[PDB]
Structure formats: C-alpha cells, structure tokens
Amino acid sequence: ERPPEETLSLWKGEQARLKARVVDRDTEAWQRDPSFSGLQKVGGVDVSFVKGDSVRACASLVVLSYPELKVVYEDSRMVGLKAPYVSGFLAFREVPFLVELVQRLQEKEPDLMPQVVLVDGNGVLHQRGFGVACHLGVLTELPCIGVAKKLLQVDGLENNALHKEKIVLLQAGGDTFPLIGSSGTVLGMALRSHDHSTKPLYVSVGHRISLEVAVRLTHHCCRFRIPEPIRQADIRSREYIRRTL
Ligand SMILES: [Mn+2]
Numbered sequence: 001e002r003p004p005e006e007t008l009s010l011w012k013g014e015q016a017r018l019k020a021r022v023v024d025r026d027t028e029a030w031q032r033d034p035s036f037s038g039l040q041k042v043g044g045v046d047v048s049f050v051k052g053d054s055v056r057a058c059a060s061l062v063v064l065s066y067p068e069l070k071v072v073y074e075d076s077r078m079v080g081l082k083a084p085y086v087s088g089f090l091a092f093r094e095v096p097f098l099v100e101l102v103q104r105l106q107e108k109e110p111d112l113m114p115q116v117v118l119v120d121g122n123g124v125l126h127q128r129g130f131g132v133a134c135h136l137g138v139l140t141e142l143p144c145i146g147v148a149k150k151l152l153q154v155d156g157l158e159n160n161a162l163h164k165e166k167i168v169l170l171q172a173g174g175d176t177f178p179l180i181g182s183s184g185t186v187l188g189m190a191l192r193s194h195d196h197s198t199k200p201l202y203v204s205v206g207h208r209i210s211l212e213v214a215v216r217l218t219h220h221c222c223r224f225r226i227p228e229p230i231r232q233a234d235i236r237s238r239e240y241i242r243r244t245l
C-alpha cells in the first residue's frame with residue numbers, strides 16, 4: 001500500500017525541481033486591496049473516494065462568486081486514481097486529475113476561470129516545501145492557497161501540548177498564530193475559521209499569493225469551519241459518489 005522507495009525518490013526529485021517555480025508573494029491587484037475589490041471568482045477543489053476502493057474517486061472543481069460565495073460552476077467527474085496516499089506525496093495521487101478539471105473549465109466556460117483556488121491540502125507547509133497546493137499552482141500558474149484540516153508535522157512542527165496551548169489562545173474567528181519551522185521560517189498559519197469552531201485550519205501559500213493575504217481570504221470564505229469553495233467541492237464530490245453508486 002506504499003510505493004517502493006525508488007519511486008518516492010523520483011517523486012522527491014520532481015518536487016524539488018518544480019518548487020523553483022513557486023511564487024510566494026502577491027501578484028494580483030485584488031490581493032493588495034483592503035476588501036479584495038476586483039476579486040469575483042474563487043475556486044475550490046477536492047477528491048472524494050469510495051468505501052472499499054482507493055482507485056475509484058470523484059474529483060470536483062467548483063467556482064464561487066465573491067463575496068457572495070454562491071456556486072457559479074461545478075465539474076464533478078468520476079476518475080480512476082492510480083497512486084496510493086503517501087504523506088508528503090498527495091499531489092501524485094490527486095493533482096493530475098485536478099489539472100484536467102481546470103483545463104476542462106478553460107474549454108467549457110473560460111470566463112469562469114477562478115482568480116484563486118483553495119486546495120484541500122497544504123502548500124509550502126510540507127516536508128519539502130512543495131505540497132499539493134503548490135503543485136497545482138505551478139502546473140496551472142493559478143494563484144492557489146493550501147488549506148489543511150490537521151497539522152502536517154514537518155520541520156519541528158508538532159501537535160503536542162505546546163501546540164494545543166496556542167490553539168486555546170485562538171479565541172475568535174480570524175485569530176491566527178504562525179507556524180514557525182526550526183529553520184526560522186513561517187511555513188503557514190493556524191486559523192480559527194469562526195467564533196463557533198475551535199479546531200483550526202492550517203493555511204499556507206500555494207502559489208502567487210502571500211501568506212497574510214491567503215489567511216485573510218480563507219477567513220472570508222468560512223461560513224463554516226471548512227472554507228466554502230473546498231466545502232462545496234467536498235460535499236458535491238461525495239454526493240456525486242453516492243448517487244451514481
Ligand atoms: Mn466584487
């Protein structure tokens with residue numbers, strides 16, 4: 001249920017090569033705006049699978065209007081995944097299919113191309129600084145934000161008692177604390193999504209966005225704990241699985 005080490009070594013080399021293309025600063029005019037004026041379309045992606053099958057899956061791309069957060073585009077399609085899940089290699093399972101959804105959008109409704117994509121999974125908060133959100137960003141050149149629902153324990157980061165103390169100090173929606181690697185680098189932020197949630201999101205740069213803008217936009221997408229673009233992709237892909245099977 002795990003690729004051989006020689007395969008993982010090839011994948012690590014690919015991740016290191018592609019990381020040279022990540023842009024971890026703002027490159028879009030709306031990103032530097034106090035209310036994100038100019039931002040109209042926010043994307044979300046996720047993949048759901050079946051109980052008893054890690055091959056058959058449903059990949060979903062949704063585009064939401066901003067700031068209303070209403071779904072203006074959905075593409076949910078059944079795919080056959082090839083690689084198993086290995087922590088640190090999520091993109092090699094999901095990202096070829098996500099790229100195909102973006103290309104299908106360009107062909108079908110090019111005027112609904114999202115201005116930024118929230119990805120279910122980390123960006124630079126990653127064993128090699130190149131998570132699935134960076135990987136989608138570099139292959140599509142779209143701005144991308146990584147949003148993970150639990151902490152990837154890399155570069156000295158750990159979900160220990162000290163980390164849980166900082167989570168307790170998050171007290172209102174929008175509060176954050178930085179995830180500082182042993183390198184002295186800020187890899188991402190823990191974010192309290194809303195007043196009535198206590199388990200934080202872990203937000204990090206995917207591509208063509210700064211961390212502080214990525215955190216603020218994620219917060220603006222949080223009707224519930226999971227940001228609405230990811231939440232809709234998650235709900236619709238699982239619903240799609242249920243109906244057809
Ligand atoms: Mn607007």
Ligand SMILES: [Mn+2]
Nearest residue numbers: 046047120121
């Ligand atoms: Mn997912």
Ligand SMILES: [Mn+2]
Nearest residue numbers: 048049234238
């Ligand atoms: Mn789930």
Ligand SMILES: [Mn+2]
Nearest residue numbers: 046047120234
């Ligand atoms: Mn999901």
